[PDB]
Amino acid sequence: NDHINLKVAGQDGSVVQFKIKRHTPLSKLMKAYSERQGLSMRQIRFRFDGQPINETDTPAQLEMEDEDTIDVFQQQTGG
């Protein structure tokens, strides 16, 4: 029954938690989050303690234990 409780805080004043294993990439959490929230899979950015992480993350997610907070933001910058 080992699961990581990630509390992602969206810039739109949205607080949502997710329960998953610490042996998989952020692609799962990011997708399930973006898909559940109301975004796209071509414009996302996860901020963890000022460290922009992509959906293809893993090492950092593995380093964690369970109690970790994140901040989902939307920044692309065109031009």
UniProtKB/Swiss-Prot annotation:
It is found in: Cytoplasm; Nucleus; Nucleus, PML body. Its main location: cytoplasm. GO terms for biological process: negative regulation of DNA binding; protein sumoylation; regulation of protein localization to nucleus. Cleavage of precursor form by SENP1, SENP2 or SENP5 is necessary for function. Residues 2-79 form the Ubiquitin-like domain. GO terms for molecular function: protein tag activity; ubiquitin-like protein ligase binding. Covalently attached to a number of proteins. Interacts with BMAL1. Interacts with USP25 (via ts SIM domain); the interaction sumoylates USP25 and inhibits its ubiquitin hydrolyzing activity. Interacts with SAE2 and UBE2I. The keyword ATP-binding does not apply. The chain holds residues 14 to 92 of 103 of the full protein. Keywords: Cytoplasm, Isopeptide bond, Nucleus, Ubl conjugation, Ubl conjugation pathway. This is Small ubiquitin-related modifier 3. Ubiquitin-like protein which can be covalently attached to target lysines either as a monomer or as a lysine-linked polymer. Does not seem to be involved in protein degradation and may function as an antagonist of ubiquitin in the degradation process. Plays a role in a number of cellular processes such as nuclear transport, DNA replication and repair, mitosis and signal transduction. Covalent attachment to its substrates requires prior activation by the E1 complex SAE1-SAE2 and linkage to the E2 enzyme UBE2I, and can be promoted by an E3 ligase such as PIAS1-4, RANBP2 or CBX4. Expressed predominantly in liver. There is a cross-link at residue 79 (Glycyl lysine isopeptide (Gly-Lys) (interchain with K-? in acceptor proteins)). Belongs to the ubiquitin family. SUMO subfamily. It comes from the Eukaryota. The gene is SUMO3. One of its GO terms (cellular component) is nucleoplasm.
